[PDB]
């Protein structure tokens, strides 16, 4: 497959590539979820959800491995790190529950509504569903092992947030010698609109490739 | 010690902390270096050099370890990775030398002027000078081991580029449970000005802390 992309077209074999859907959980995409409660704007994620469902259909039909990440922790937040971890101090979900004790134990908590994948996106048998405890899917997980075990070198990224969990995973992939592509219209940022722009700029200029869902699906059809 | 910072002040022991000077080489800071030749703006880096000098002087007097990074490779570029590596295809120095063959072997090459630290910044005995082959100082190097061996948990970052080698090293530090601070007036971005604001926003909001050189030196004075 040759995929039209910025800053130039790339090539990849779908059967040695994966589509990663980053954190399409109510926490990151749905009114009333963690990001909304923490002051971020999730009001425009409807199209991102639809575009991801379209990209998953195409990717799976082409034999690409589908990997779903769910970000979060046990409901006691042992896995988030206590005060000795910077994550305890940086986590906007932990900050929100420290200010709003009614929410304690609900944000990003395994088994909870916040942690659930959005209703529209349902993994199928044979897909990989990976929990992760930090923004990058390549730290503290078997992601690299899973991919290496299948000879996969090309990663197509979708999900939320473009500038945090998506970009962190793509950047770490580059340092692990993976070729990373992001489908811009299947992502959404956490922060002002410049965070989306800057994330795609950093990726295109230094780390990987940018394309979009329509291009991706058309390239996969043969 | 308290460091006033965004989004809130932190506490740290300077003697269990390190000041990291990222890639203050002619490549990244000086007219006629790689970034300039590649079309990035380095017109404004002279105050950044001066501010790094001030921060280094304060850190050393407080007993903070100083770590200098030099980014680059052998002059045949074996260490940049061949065509099997995404670095070979993303590297803007390689791209520039492909378009301008008179520059081949001259950018980011060990032994070259481009690769040298700027004349104004001179490592002192007791500092550590680390080479690195990729944007993140934590991949492919002994950096994590060096810091752990000395019980260092707090990293104060300066250098170029804010959004690439700086932010990448800080983000990976966070995933390795380091508390990272960037001194914003001691950094410069590679790209448009929005890339500076976006890196600082991402750091302040998700990965670490933002301060500045004056606040840092004042914090260290007692």
Curated annotation (Swiss-Prot), chains A, B:
Enzyme's top EC category: hydrolase
Catalytic site positions: 23, 132, 165
Reaction(s) this enzyme catalyzes, per UniProt: (Z)-3-ureidoacrylate + H2O + H(+) = (Z)-3-aminoacrylate + NH4(+) + CO2; (Z)-3-ureidoacrylate + H2O = (Z)-3-aminoacrylate + carbamate + H(+); (Z)-2-methylureidoacrylate + H2O + H(+) = (Z)-2-methylaminoacrylate + NH4(+) + CO2
GO BP: nitrogen utilization; uracil catabolic process
Origin superkingdom: Bacteria
GO molecular function, one term: hydrolase activity, acting on carbon-nitrogen (but not peptide) bonds, in linear amides
Stated family: Belongs to the isochorismatase family. RutB subfamily.
Record protein name field: Ureidoacrylate amidohydrolase RutB
Species of provenance: Escherichia coli (strain ATCC 33849 / DSM 4235 / NCIMB 12045 / K12 / DH1)
